[PDB]
Amino acid sequence: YTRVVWCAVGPEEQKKCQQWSQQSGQNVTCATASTTDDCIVLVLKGEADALNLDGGYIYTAGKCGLVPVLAENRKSSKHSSLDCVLRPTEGYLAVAVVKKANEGLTWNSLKDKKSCHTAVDRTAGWNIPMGLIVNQTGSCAFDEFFSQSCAPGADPKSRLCALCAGDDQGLDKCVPNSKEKYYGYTGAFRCLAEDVGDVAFVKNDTVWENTNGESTADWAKNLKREDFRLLCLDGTRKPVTEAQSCHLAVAPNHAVVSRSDRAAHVEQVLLHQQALFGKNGKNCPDKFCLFKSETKNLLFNDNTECLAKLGGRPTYEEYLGTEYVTAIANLKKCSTSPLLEACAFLTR
Amino acid sequence: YTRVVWCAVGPEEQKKCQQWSQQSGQNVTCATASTTDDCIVLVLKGEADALNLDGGYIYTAGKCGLVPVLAENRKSSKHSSLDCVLRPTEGYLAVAVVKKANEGLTWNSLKDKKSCHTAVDRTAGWNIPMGLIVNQTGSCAFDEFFSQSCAPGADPKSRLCALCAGDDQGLDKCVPNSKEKYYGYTGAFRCLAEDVGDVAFVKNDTVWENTNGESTADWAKNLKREDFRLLCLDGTRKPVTEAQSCHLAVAPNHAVVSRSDRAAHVEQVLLHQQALFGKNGKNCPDKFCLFKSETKNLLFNDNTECLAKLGGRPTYEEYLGTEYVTAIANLKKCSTSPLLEACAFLTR
Numbered sequence A, B: 001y002t003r004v005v006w007c008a009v010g011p012e013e014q015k016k017c018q019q020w021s022q023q024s025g026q027n028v029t030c031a032t033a034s035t036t037d038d039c040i041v042l043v044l045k046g047e048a049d050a051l052n053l054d055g056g057y058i059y060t061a062g063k064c065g066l067v068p069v070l071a072e073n074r075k076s077s078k079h080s081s082l083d084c085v086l087r088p089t090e091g092y093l094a095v096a097v098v099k100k101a102n103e104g105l106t107w108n109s110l111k112d113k114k115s116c117h118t119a120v121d122r123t124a125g126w127n128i129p130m131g132l133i134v135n136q137t138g139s140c141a142f143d144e145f146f147s148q149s150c151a152p153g154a155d156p157k158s159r160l161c162a163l164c165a166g167d168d169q170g171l172d173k174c175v176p177n178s179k180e181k182y183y184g185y186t187g188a189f190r191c192l193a194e195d196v197g198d199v200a201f202v203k204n205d206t207v208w209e210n211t212n213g214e215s216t217a218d219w220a221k222n223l224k225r226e227d228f229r230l231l232c233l234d235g236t237r238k239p240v241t242e243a244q245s246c247h248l249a250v251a252p253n254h255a256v257v258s259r260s261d262r263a264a265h266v267e268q269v270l271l272h273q274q275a276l277f278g279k280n281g282k283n284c285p286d287k288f289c290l291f292k293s294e295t296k297n298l299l300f301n302d303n304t305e306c307l308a309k310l311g312g313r314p315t316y317e318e319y320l321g322t323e324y325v326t327a328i329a330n331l332k333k334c335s336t337s338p339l340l341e342a343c344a345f346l347t348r
């Protein structure tokens, strides 16, 4: 079985993956599920092989035995010309973000406001913010800390899904895939933009990429960096350029995961795949660009140069950073989920 | 070692083979196995010299070091000035056949239907439709695509063999030799004919040959060429006279393969043999007919006019054509053959 079956979360991702299968002559094939958690289960069953994952999902899969194959990697300023696949990863910034126009809203007045989150269990969208809010307030009731949210993946009869828009017909509110208008990085930021929420937790890179003519997408052509601000943990606010000084935390980059018995096959298949279709591969754009989704972030984030190598053969823990595994761990004392419970024994 | 050991797949191909041998004066003798894959093995062991094979099987043979020697040739219309043996080959049209009565069945509503196949690994029966399907669908899961099938050679427990009737007894259900009621071109079309299946993947030439009194077999004589249609890629349904505009692809002709050292000897031996027992041969039908098997396509297809020579010495790759060879490799990234796996290092 040479083919690497890839896991597409949601129908929009499934289409780009169907495309990739066709271009790759079945070097890659598609399986899908509605959610990432579901996909992780296919990867476990052996029904799929691999998929690229936010660091928080990496911890879920990590727990269930899956391991990290190659990290997503983006442009760089520091050391900005060693080869992409061997150049170390620099992480990204998880930020709290607001309309500038609104005032009196700051980290310390967040309680009882309205939130937009990438989706539940994700790193910047969720794990970091809710992480801190737990440590600070000192209670496990983050489900009630904000007045309402969009938090795809949460309980959809609950308040954390109260603000989610669903798709075009409004079907499937709160399903944590790209058919939910406010899903993921761009979803969240848009939930901010349309004033459905007060704060939105995202990465620095997400505001720059959807303001000031960078997206030519109806919801975001006219958006202006000026109209937004970043809450720091100071109590303070700064514009988006000071993100380095105004960020909640540093996050580990998305990364591909698979089963260990499938890691090397997958890593190799992918390295060739990116050479074919990656940022500067033979066939991109003449044929297929693996890293472009028109700002919809499918399979991969659109600002990925290449998938890069990892020091040794790490585990979720080496890969994520021991500092983060604890932040996630401690947040997770305040809530259970099917997959961590079902897999808890593997890692005891 | 002058005798040519001929590989006969199955007992019926066996009886014919020995009659040939008795006439041959032992210039030709027979081995047998249950399948075409086993027969190749025999050749690899050198317990047999050669046999005649569908292109798909030629791929397998080729991967195992074996080479093509001469190609089946059948009546043409154009180019009819040369001798059959020196007249270049055309190659067959591989096609999808449904009953006309079953309406709303098109290339695009095949999923979950019941299919008939010549055999796993064959060209029209398998490699073509199953390659296209796999490719269009982006999924290597062909084993779950038809609700049921008769794909002789597949795993007999599985649903690709659900519809296979075996011999008169009901024994050897799904073995890919002629004993299986639904084996080969003839059997796949019959499968459709007796409404065991909805679709059937054969070649244009099979349909003609078994409708409107073409075959005086009980199951075929009453068959009526109108009652049938062809599926085209566009999505439409032409009648069987539009094979030219409603075919899936163009198949290379079957050819004889042999171990490489033995090619010329087999070539010489066979050229003479046909002169004797071929179409116009001093001894057909007085003593023996090499290309006539009573509508069973034993050893060779019953429509074979002679065995032609081939421009130069070709690789199996050159014979099959770079494009078909790619289609196959790509489809085979979803399976494993123990045979191919073996050949991958066991061959000079």
Ligand SMILES: *[C@@H]1O[C@H](CO)[C@@H](O[C@@H]2O[C@H](CO)[C@@H](O[C@@H]3O[C@H](CO)[C@@H](O)[C@H](O)[C@@H]3O)[C@H](O)[C@H]2NC(C)=O)[C@H](O)[C@H]1NC(C)=O
Binding pocket: A023, A024, A025, A027, A272, A273, A276
């Ligand atoms: C599908 O997968 C295979 C990966 O197995 C790709 O085929 C392989 O591609 C390399 C090209 O990168 C082939 O040739 C190479 O040539 C250079 C010399 O110019 C040499 O440095 C290398 O050692 C190698 O020989 C390689 O043979 C080939 N392997 C096979 C089995 O075909 C293919 O590109 C992938 N196709 C798609 C569409 O992704």
Ligand SMILES: *[C@@H]1O[C@H](CO)[C@@H](O[C@@H]2O[C@H](CO)[C@@H](O[C@@H]3O[C@H](CO)[C@@H](O)[C@H](O)[C@@H]3O)[C@H](O)[C@H]2NC(C)=O)[C@H](O)[C@H]1NC(C)=O
Binding pocket: A075, A076, A077, A080, A093, A204, A205, A206, A208, A209, A214, A241, A242, A243, A244
């Ligand atoms: C927050 O995210 C934004 C966007 O991801 C970051 O801005 C980007 O910064 C890089 C360099 O740091 C820019 O690339 C540069 O391009 C010029 C040529 O135009 C070149 O001379 C430099 O050597 C470098 O390659 C990139 O264009 C820029 N993108 C945009 C749309 O502004 C920003 O750095 C991030 N902020 C923090 C604190 O990390």
Ligand SMILES: *[C@@H]1O[C@H](CO)[C@@H](O[C@@H]2O[C@H](CO)[C@@H](O[C@@H]3O[C@H](CO)[C@@H](O)[C@H](O)[C@@H]3O)[C@H](O)[C@H]2NC(C)=O)[C@H](O)[C@H]1NC(C)=O
Binding pocket: B075, B076, B077, B093, B204, B205, B206, B208, B209, B214, B241, B242, B243, B244
């Ligand atoms: C699809 O397959 C059928 C059967 O294999 C093809 O029909 C066959 O066509 C050839 C000629 O093109 C026929 O031979 C002709 O016979 C007459 C005398 O009967 C002669 O005057 C011509 O010069 C020529 O030799 C053959 O009889 C015929 N067989 C049957 C049963 O109809 C058809 O050509 C194929 N279609 C496509 C698009 O390839």
Ligand SMILES: *[C@@H]1O[C@H](CO)[C@@H](O)[C@H](O)[C@H]1NC(C)=O
Binding pocket: B023, B024, B025, B027
């Ligand atoms: C078998 O051997 C040779 C071919 O060189 C020939 O003299 C003899 O006639 C052949 N016999 C038959 C029946 O093919």
Ligand SMILES: *[C@@H]1O[C@H](CO)[C@@H](O)[C@H](O)[C@H]1NC(C)=O
Binding pocket: A022, B135, B136
């Ligand atoms: C299947 O592969 C072929 C190339 O072999 C490609 O042209 C085609 O796009 C693929 N199928 C579809 C429906 O595009």
Ligand SMILES: [Fe+3]
Binding pocket: A054, A055, A122, A123, A124, A125, A251, A254
């Ligand atoms: Fe993230």
Ligand SMILES: [Fe+3]
Binding pocket: B054, B055, B122, B123, B124, B251
């Ligand atoms: Fe064939």
